[PDB]
Structure 1
């Protein structure tokens, strides 16, 4: 499902993402924007280390979800990467919150550093009424 900007921004707000770990909704929009353009189907293979980034937040199968194909990876006791490709983003959100409790926080996604770090991210939540 390709989301609309404000719909997503309201959705994440409902899921408790605003101010989570010191991370505004505006920053969560920025991240999702630059990671998948707001598309839940988004899948990015990483030929070099042979990993895959899944869903709206482009979660990597080596550390947080397992697809079985990834070399050097988390056991099939975890969450399946398929769960991150659904239209409903509650699970991706759940995993997202997990990823960031690690010390580096939001810096986890290099894309956020490149595009969202130390900048005015308000355009993302602009007029969404949240």
Structure 2
């Protein structure tokens, strides 16, 4: 599923990401744009051998199991493939754990490099 921008904002708000750990909804939408281009099916291998999965590019070294990342933890207790669903529920629940872990949204490299410090509210402007 390639989400539309407002469509993703709606789904993230429904699942309770707006202001979760103090991050406004446009932070989450901006993270998704730059991590996955709003594509639930996105996968990208990282230099360390892990892979990032789904709409928020959640990593196989710590958060989900893909069965090919030595030293994997699976702190969200999910197969990584479940993060590619057209339904974002598992991705959102796992992102909640991630963002609660200590460094907040800085856990998302694309957020830190392309969203943090910018006008993130622009990402939900025009949406109902």
Which category describes the TM-score, using the shorter chain as reference length? over 0.9
Q: TM-score, normalised by structure 2?
A: 0.95
Shift of 1:32: 0.3
| Alpha carbons 1:53, 1:59 under 8 Å: kept | yes
| Alpha carbons 1:68, 1:76 under 8 Å: kept | no
Shift of 1:78: 2.0
Secondary structure of 2:126's aligned partner: coil
Indicate the residue corresponding to 2:78 in structure 1: 79
Q: CA 1:14/1:44 → structure 2, altered by over 3 Å: closer, same or farther?
A: same
Moved over 6 A (4+): none
Post-superposition CA distance 1:60-100 (Å, at most 9, x none):
00100011100211159921101101110001000010100
Indicate the residue corresponding to 2:11 in structure 1: 11
Indicate the residue corresponding to 1:90 in structure 2: 89
Secondary structure of 1:100's aligned partner: helix
**Corresponding pairs, count:** 128
Indicate the residue corresponding to 1:22 in structure 2: 22
Shift of 1:121: 1.0
What root-mean-square deviation, in Å, do the aligned CA atoms of Structure 1 and Structure 2 show?
1.4
Secondary structure of 1:44's aligned partner: strand
Q: CA 1:71/1:10 → structure 2, altered by over 3 Å: closer, same or farther?
A: same
Residues 1-130 of structure 1 aligned to structure 2 (within 5 Å): 1-46=1-46, 48-74=47-73, 78-129=77-128
Gaps of 5+ in 2: none
Secondary structure of 2:100's aligned partner: coil
Secondary structure of 2:45's aligned partner: strand
Q: TM-score, normalised by structure 1?
A: 0.94
